[PDB]
């Protein structure tokens, strides 16, 4: 009925890491290519994703145990889960009132038709919105939110990983922390952990849909030239 | 003492091509990553060069005879001369009064210390400025300016070209047009053609200095990630 010292330190490290890598003011966005509303929004969103990947990488290197993995496994986990971590962390900006990502005034408020001007269709954009709504309804504590990101990144079931035994070992330790935290520090969360694991499976399908929409983008040189070097390297298949 | 019909058509095509690929208002620059004044200006200048490369490519495809070359020779000529054409066309924006490239108000006025915040040193920046001043003093007509760009691009002496015989053939035809135009349409230009050929040799040395400064940039991944896909492809050596 009480969190251990080690489980607390793991929680302290993740919350600090997330605070070190997420700006609730979104003030770096003026540094991106400005949004325009023929894939009109692609340059801005590419800069947005490239920026978030650097933040996910910063967050990952502070997950306990991650830096002990080989550089190969770190890359393997980063490449496969990068888009899933981005969809998870974007929930902090998602607003239920306007059903969009409100990162600013008119410019940085990202609604559905804006992602359309980036190679995606209204139809395939549907499960992303539903995922964000259901995730928003869980009203996760920062600890639960940050623990879910770390668990997602440390999935042993990624194409590329080698020491899946030890990545699974690290992920289960984090899953133990989340279960304990929910049980002893979240009132009325009797089914929350199960629901969070459900969102992870949803991210897998959203990940696969992005994978295919991205192969279209990266195969058209006039669109892939709009991407950034980091995006092409993280979402490329040149392992 | 009179321009031929063919020499006029070659002049008409180049002036139209340059007018189709150079904006004297520089209004697309708000679409670049904004300038900031640790290689602070690099993202803006990278977007600037990437944009100019697309314009040089557009200009090149309208040079008479260029489209008849193989795609290999076109790439070979583009990759070797891209930075030289950029330095030539930038002279239209270079102002002698402030010794800078005045493409806007405070933001898009590019002085010496701004290029320093892009991996270049004050010392190596010297021949670029002297080149621009001497080029500005020639007071070239648009025809002479646009003819010099086409002659530069069609140099048979580039690493990579194959049918150097026919690229040399195209370049000499353009050199004939420039000599004839200067002789019959430019008063007091008795030595202008010789001076323009001198500027071409100067571009070769500026090109080699950029080549080495760029290898430094492209070998540091934290800097090369700031570049664009087009820049890395044009200035890369993966032929």
């Amino acid at each position: 009925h009480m969190l251990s010292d080690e489980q607390m330190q793991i929680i302290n490290s993740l919350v600090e890491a997330h605070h070190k890598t997420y700006d609730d003011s979104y003030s770096d966005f003026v540094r991106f290519r400005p949004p325009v509303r023929r894939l009109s929004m692609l340059p801005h969103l590419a800069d947005l994703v490239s920026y978030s990947i650097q933040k996910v990488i910063g967050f990952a290197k502070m997950i306990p145990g991650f830096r002990d993995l080989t550089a190969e496994d770190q890359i393997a986990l980063l490449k496969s889960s990068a888009i899933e971590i981005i969809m998870l962390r974007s929930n902090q900006s998602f607003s239920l009132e306007d059903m969009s990502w409100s990162c600013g005034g008119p410019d940085f408020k990202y609604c559905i038709n804006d992602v359309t001007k980036a190679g995606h269709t209204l139809e395939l954009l549907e499960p992303l919105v539903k995922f964000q709504v259901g995730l928003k309804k869980l009203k996760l504590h920062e600890e639960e939110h940050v623990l879910l990101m770390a668990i997602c990144l440390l999935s042993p079931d990624r194409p590329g990983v080698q020491d899946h035994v030890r990545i699974e070992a690290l992920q289960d330790r984090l899953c133990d922390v989340l279960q304990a935290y929910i049980r002893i520090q979240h009132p009325g969360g009797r089914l929350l952990y199960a629901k969070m694991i459900q969102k992870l499976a949803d991210l897998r399908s959203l990940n696969e849909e992005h994978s295919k929409q991205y192969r279209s983008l990266s195969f058209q040189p006039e669109h892939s030239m709009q991407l950034t070097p980091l995006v092409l390297e993280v979402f490329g298949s040149e392992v | 003492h009179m321009l031929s019909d063919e020499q006029m058509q070659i002049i008409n095509s180049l002036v139209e091509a340059h007018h189709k690929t150079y904006d004297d208002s520089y209004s697309d620059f708000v679409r670049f990553r904004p300038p900031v004044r640790r290689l602070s200006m690099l993202p803006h200048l990278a977007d600037l060069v990437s944009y100019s490369i697309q314009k040089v490519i557009g200009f090149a495809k309208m040079i008479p005879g260029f489209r008849d070359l193989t795609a290999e020779d076109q790439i070979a000529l583009l990759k070797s001369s891209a930075i030289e054409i950029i330095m030539l066309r930038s002279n239209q924006s270079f102002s002698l009064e402030d010794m800078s490239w005045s493409c806007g108000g405070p933001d898009f006025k590019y002085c010496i210390n701004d290029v320093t915040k892009a991996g270049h040193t004050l010392e190596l920046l010297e021949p670029l400025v002297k080149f621009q001043v001497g080029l500005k003093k020639l007071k070239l007509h648009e025809e002479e300016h646009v003819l010099l760009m086409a002659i530069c691009l069609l140099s048979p002496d580039r690493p990579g070209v194959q049918d150097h015989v026919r690229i040399e053939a195209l370049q000499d035809r353009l050199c004939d047009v420039l000599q004839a135009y200067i002789r019959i349409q430019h008063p007091g230009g008795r030595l202008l053609y010789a001076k323009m050929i001198q500027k071409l040799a100067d571009l070769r040395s500026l090109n080699e200095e950029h080549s080495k400064q760029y290898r430094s940039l492209s070998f540091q991944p934290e800097h090369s990630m700031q570049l664009t896909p087009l820049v890395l492809e044009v200035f890369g050596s993966e032929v």
Binding site: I57, E238, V239 | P221, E222
Partner: peptide
């Protein structure tokens, strides 16, 4: 390759 990722991972 993965030069950027190797660099960003310190």
């Amino acid at each position: 390759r993965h030069k950027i990722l190797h660099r960003l991972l310190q």
